[PDB]
Amino acid sequence: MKFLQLPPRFMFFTGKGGVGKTSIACATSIQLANAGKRVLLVSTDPASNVGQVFGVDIGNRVTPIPAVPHLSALEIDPEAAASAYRERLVGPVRGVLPDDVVKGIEESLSGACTTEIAAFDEFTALLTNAVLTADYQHIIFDTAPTGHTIRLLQLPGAWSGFDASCLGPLAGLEKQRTQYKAAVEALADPLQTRLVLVARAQQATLREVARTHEELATIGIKQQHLVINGILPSAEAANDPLAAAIHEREQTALKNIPATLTSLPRDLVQLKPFNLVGLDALRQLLTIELDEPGMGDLVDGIEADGHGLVMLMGKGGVGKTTLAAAIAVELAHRGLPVHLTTSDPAAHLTDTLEASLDNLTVSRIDPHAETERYRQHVLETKGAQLDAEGRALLEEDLHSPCTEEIAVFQAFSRIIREAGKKFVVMDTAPTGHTLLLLDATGATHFTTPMMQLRDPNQTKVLVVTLAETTPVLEAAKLQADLRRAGIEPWAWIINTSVAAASAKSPLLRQRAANELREINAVANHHADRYAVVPLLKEEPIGAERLRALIHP
Numbered sequence: 059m060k061f062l063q064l065p066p067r068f069m070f071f072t073g074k075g076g077v078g079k080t081s082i083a084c085a086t087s088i089q090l091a092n093a094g095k096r097v098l099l100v101s102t103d104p105a106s107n108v109g110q111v112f113g114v115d116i117g118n119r120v121t122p123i124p125a126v127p128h129l130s131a132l133e134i135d136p137e138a139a140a141s142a143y144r145e146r147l148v149g150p151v152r153g154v155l156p157d158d159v160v161k162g163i164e165e166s167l168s169g170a171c172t173t174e175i176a177a178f179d180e181f182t183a184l185l186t187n188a189v190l191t192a193d194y195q196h197i198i199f200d201t202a203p204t205g206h207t208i209r210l211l212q213l214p215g216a217w218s219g220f221d222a223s224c225l226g227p228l229a230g231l232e233k234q235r236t237q238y239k240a241a242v243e244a245l246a247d248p249l250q251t252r253l254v255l256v257a258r259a260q261q262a263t264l265r266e267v268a269r270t271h272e273e274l275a276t277i278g279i280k281q282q283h284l285v286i287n288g289i290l291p292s293a294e295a296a297n298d299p300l301a302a303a304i305h306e307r308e309q310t311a312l313k314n315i316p317a318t319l320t321s322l323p324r325d326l327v328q329l330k331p332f333n334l335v336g337l338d339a340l341r342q343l344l345t346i347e348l349d350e351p352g353m354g355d356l357v358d359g360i361e362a363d364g365h366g367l368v369m370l371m372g373k374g375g376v377g378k379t380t381l382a383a384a385i386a387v388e389l390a391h392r393g394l395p396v397h398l399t400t401s402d403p404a405a406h407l408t409d410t411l412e413a414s415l416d417n418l419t420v421s422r423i424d425p426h427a428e429t430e431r432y433r434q435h436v437l438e439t440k441g442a443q444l445d446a447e448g449r450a451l452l453e454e455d456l457h458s459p460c461t462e463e464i465a466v467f468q469a470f471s472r473i474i475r476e477a478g479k480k481f482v483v484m485d486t487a488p489t490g491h492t493l494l495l496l497d498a499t500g501a502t503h504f505t506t507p508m509m510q511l512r513d514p515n516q517t518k519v520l521v522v523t524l525a526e527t528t529p530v531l532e533a534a535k536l537q538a539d540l541r542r543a544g545i546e547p548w549a550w551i552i553n554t555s556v557a558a559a560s561a562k563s564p565l566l567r568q569r570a571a572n573e574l575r576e577i578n579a580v581a582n583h584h585a586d587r588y589a590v591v592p593l594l595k596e597e598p599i600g601a602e603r604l605r606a607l608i609h610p
C-alpha cells in the first residue's frame with residue numbers, strides 16, 4: 059500500500075465507526091513486525107476482541123504476542139478512564155453539596171465528549187512517555203482524536219471552573235499543560251505522525267471523512283493518507299443483480315470523490331471473503347431465507363397508537379432520512395396526516411410529492427445554518443463577561459457535535475409545537491446526553507419539555523442501526539444513554555440487511571450470515587420489537603419506490 063512506506067514513529071487512524079479501523083491497524087502492525095521493526099499496537103475499543111485475534115489476553119499492561127516476534131500489544135479503556143474521572147471529581151463533593159450540583163456534575167462528565175477527552179488523555183499519556191516511545195520504534199493506534207478535541211486541548215485558559223457547553227471533561231485533566239502541548243506538537247509534526255483516514259466507498263461516508271480531513275488540515279496536520287476499505291470485487295457480481303448494483307454504486311462513489319480529498323494519496327482494499335477473525339485472515343488483508351418482521355408491523359403499531367411522534371435516532375450514515383421518508387409516505391398513503399421534517403439539504407427524498415398528496419407536508423431544516431445561528435446567538439450571551447481567552451474557549455467549545463445537536467433539536471421544537479393532532483416524523487433525535495443537560499440547565503429558541511419525550515404515549519424513539527458488530531455496540535451504547543435519560547426506545551430498525559435481500563454469491567452470503575448473527579443478537583438482548591429493512595438494489599430517492607422499503 060501507499061501508507062506503509064518509510065512510516066514515521068506514530069501512526070493513527072480515524073473514520074466512521076465500523077469501517078475497519080481495527081482490522082487495518084492490526085494488519086499494519088503484523089506487517090511491520092514481520093518486516094523487523096518493533097511495534098506497539100494500541101487498541102481503543104474495550105470490546106474490540108483484539109486479544110482474541112492475536113490469541114493472547116491484552117490489558118492495560120503491555121504484553122508481547124508470542125506468535126509474532128517483535129510485536130507488543132496494549133489497550134486503552136476510555137470508559138474506564140471516564141468512570142475514574144467521574145469518581146475522583148464527584149466523590150469529594152458527594153454528601154456535602156446539593157443534589158442539583160451533583161446531578162449537574164455527573165451529567166457534564168458523562169457522554170461521548172467525556173469518552174473522547176479521556177481517550178485523548180490516554181493518547182497523550184502514551185505519547186511523550188519515559189520509555190514507551192523510546193523502546194518501541196513504531197506505535198499504531200486504532201482511533202485518532204477528533205479535530206474538536208485537538209483544538210480544545212491546545213487552547214489556553216483556566217479549566218478549574220467546570221450552559222450547555224461541554225468544557226466539563228477538561229476540568230478532570232490532571233496532567234500539566236506542557237504535557238498536552240508537547241503531545242499536540244508531536245501529533246501535528248509530519249515527521250512523527252502520519253494520520254490515515256479509513257472510509258467506506260459510499261457517498262455519505264466519503265463526505266463525512268472529507269469533513270474530518272478539512273478539520274484536521276485546519277488544525278495543522280499537513281500530510282495524510284486515504285485508505286478506501288470495502289471495495290466489492292467486480293467479478294463477484296457475475297450473476298447477482300444486487301452485487302452488480304452494489305458494484306455500480308461503489309464505482310460511482312470512487313469516480314466522484316470530494317474535491318478536498320483528491321490530492322491525498324489513495325489506496326484500495328478488496329473485501330476479502332475470508333472472515334477477519336484469525337491471524338491468517340489479517341495477514342493477507344493488505345495484499346438462505348431470512349424471515350423477520352418488516353416495517354409493516356412497526357407502521358401498524360404506530361397507526362394503532364396515532365397522534366404520536368416517530369423520532370428516529372442513530373449514528374450518521376445509517377439511512378435515518380430514507381427510513382423517515384418511507385414511514386411518512388406510508389402513513390400518508392393510508393390517509394392519516396404526516397409532517398416529515400427531514401434535515402438532509404443535500405438531497406430531496408419526498409420532492410414533488412407534497413402537492414400530489416393532499417395531507418403530506420415537509421419542513422427542510424439545514425443543520426449547518428441552524429448550528430451557525432445558535433453559535434452566533436450564544437456568542438453574545440456569556441461572551442461579553444468572559445475575557446478574550448474565555449470567549450475564544452467558548453467559541454471553540456461550541457463547535458462540538460453537542461452544540462450542533464442542540465441547535466437541530468431547538469429548530470425541531472418549533473415544528474413540534476406547531477403540529478398538534480398530527481403525526482410528526484423526525485430525522486435525528488438528540489442523544490441522551492443532550493436531553494439530560496438541556497433539562498437540568500433549563501430546570502428565541504425554546505426546547506420541548508422532557509415530560510413529553512419521556513412519555514411512552516407520545517414519543518416513540520426508534521433506533522436505526524446498521525447490521526454489523528461496531529454499529530450494534532454503539533447503538534446499544536446510545537440506547538443505554540437514552541435509558542439513563544429516562545426515555546425508552548420503542549423499537550429497533552436494522553437497516554441494509556443483505557440477508558433480507560436476495561443474495562446468491564459467496565461474499566454477499568457471508569455478509570448475510572454475519573448480519574443474521576447481528577439481527578439475532580439484537581432480537582435477543584437489545585430490543586423487544588425489531589424490524590429489518592433490506593438493502594434496496596435501486597437507490598431510494600423517489601416517491602413511489604420508497605414503498606419498496608415498507609413492503610419488501
Ligand SMILES: Nc1ncnc2c1ncn2[C@@H]1O[C@H](COP(=O)(O)OP(=O)(O)O)[C@@H](O)[C@H]1O
Nearest residue numbers: 075076077078079080081327328329330334528
Ligand atoms: N477489507 C475487509 N475485508 C473483509 N472484511 C472486513 C474488511 N474490513 C473490515 N471487515 C469486517 O468488518 C468487521 C468489523 O470491523 P472493525 O475492525 O470493527 O472496524 P472498526 O474498528 O472501525 O469498528 C470485521 O468483523 C471484519 O470482518
Ligand SMILES: Nc1ncnc2c1ncn2[C@@H]1O[C@H](COP(=O)(O)OP(=O)(O)O)[C@@H](O)[C@H]1O
Nearest residue numbers: 262374375376377378379380591592593594597
Ligand atoms: N434501506 C436502504 N437500502 C439501500 N440504501 C439505503 C437504504 N437506506 C439508506 N440508504 C442509502 O444510504 C445513503 C445515506 O443515508 P442517509 O439517509 O443520508 O443517512 P442520514 O440518515 O445520516 O442522512 C443514501 O444515499 C441512501 O441511498
Ligand SMILES: [Mg+2]
Nearest residue numbers: 079080103106
Ligand atoms: Mg474498532
Ligand SMILES: [Mg+2]
Nearest residue numbers: 378379401402
Ligand atoms: Mg441524515
